[PDB]
Amino acid sequence: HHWGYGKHNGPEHWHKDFPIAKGERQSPVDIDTHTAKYDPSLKPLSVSYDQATSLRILNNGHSFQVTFDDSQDKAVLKGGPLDGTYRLLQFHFHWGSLDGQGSEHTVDKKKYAAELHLVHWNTKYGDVGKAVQQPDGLAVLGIFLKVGSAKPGLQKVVDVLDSIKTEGKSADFTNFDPRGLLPESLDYWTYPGSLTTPPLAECVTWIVLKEPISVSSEQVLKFRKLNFNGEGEPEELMVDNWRPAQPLKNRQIKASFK
Ligand SMILES: O=C1NS(=O)(=O)c2cc(-n3cc(CO[C@@H]4O[C@H](CO)[C@@H](O)[C@H](O)[C@H]4O)nn3)ccc21
Ligand SMILES: [Zn+2]
């Protein structure tokens, strides 16, 4: 009885194995745009992805992820609300069964069709395992996806999904440039939160971009043909792998823009 997103092992059950699920800085949250506070002391984000080295793409049974070489300062995030340098480790997506759901964060209760998470870890802690134990260990860049025109920089990902259909499958995925996934603007909201999957550690500075990227209906359709199950088991489509919004409690959401 592992955790997942079904009726019997979904987000409402996770607290039994991970009691921090009911903690004080859980993610995702609804971003109320009229109560977020513009903070002029926030710096522009600095995204330096020019030397990124992607390694593999993997279906982990919960989402699919692209992993990067994080052994040096190749692809780093700095600035914004962050102190220090955060290395890119992986990206993955959360998506829905229908176009009106799929994101984890919401904006004035609006849900997007998917959400992209670029996960980075604070190099002062030496390895990612140490970083997850610290309140400033991780920085996740979140990007909303809406259905519209195709995103050409996503197509290399879509085209390899057939080869990682079921849980446990991986493939070589080199020379992918994550800059092709970013919107035009880097305006953002930020707040202190958590991982959105077990173990739900409260170690994340969230940086959620205001501007969504557009992807085509055919691109999102390919996400929805992945499988939660391993090869040989009964087919269960990988859809609706998102955690609902959690209480904000004693936290302020700050905006880099007004
Ligand atoms: O679905 C999710 N959305 S999210 O909140 O952006 C997120 C983050 C993670 N993170 C996982 C990790 C650590 O991953 C591995 O963990 C071990 C120790 O955990 C290392 O020893 C290993 O080498 C490291 O590669 N850091 N973030 C996983 C899933 C989601
Ligand atoms: Zn995620």
- Which region, left, alpha or beta, applies to residue 61 given φ > 0 means left and ψ of -120 to 50 means alpha? left
Contact 174, 67 (CB under 8 A): no
Q: What is the resolution of this structure in A?
A: 1.3
Rounded Cα gap, residues 20 and 136, in angstroms: 17
Ligand 1 center to residue 138 CA distance, Å? 9
Paired with 214 in beta bridges are: 146
Rounded Cα gap, residues 253 and 239, in angstroms: 29
Which residue, judged by its Cα, is nearest atom 17 of ligand 1? 129
Residues 6+ apart with CB under 8 A from 71: none
CB of 117 closer than 6 A to ligand 1? Answer: yes
Find the DSSP H helices in 108-247.
Answer: 128-131, 155-160, 217-223
Rounded Cα gap, residues 204 and 134, in angstroms: 9
Rounded Cα gap, residues 17 and 11, in angstroms: 11
Residues lining ion ligand 2 (Cβ < 5 A) are 117
Token couple for 82? 């962050």
- State the CATH architecture for 1-258: Roll (3.10)
Which residue, judged by its Cα, is nearest atom 5 of ligand 1? 195
Note every long-range contact of 9-13, with CB atoms under 8 Å and residues 24 or more positions apart, other chains counting: 11/243, 11/244
Contact 185, 211 (CB under 8 A): yes
Which residue, judged by its Cα, is nearest atom 3 of ligand 1? 196
Instruction: Return the closest-CA partner of residue 78 out of 109, 47, 122.
Output: 47
Name the residue of 29, 55, 117 whose CB sits within 8 Å of the most ligand 1 atoms, as the mutation to test its pocket. 117
15 part of the active site: no
Method: X-ray
> Would you list the DSSP string of 112-136?
PSEEEEEEEEEGGGSSHHHHTTSTT
Token couple for 6? 């079904």
Rounded Cα gap, residues 144 and 161, in angstroms: 20
Contact 250, 26 (CB under 8 A): no
Whether the bond into 28 is cis, omega within 30 of 0: yes
Token couple for 110? 């609006």
Rounded Cα gap, residues 214 and 209, in angstroms: 13
Token couple for 250? 């004693």
- Which region, left, alpha or beta, applies to residue 14 given φ > 0 means left and ψ of -120 to 50 means alpha? alpha
Contact 123, 84 (CB under 8 A): yes
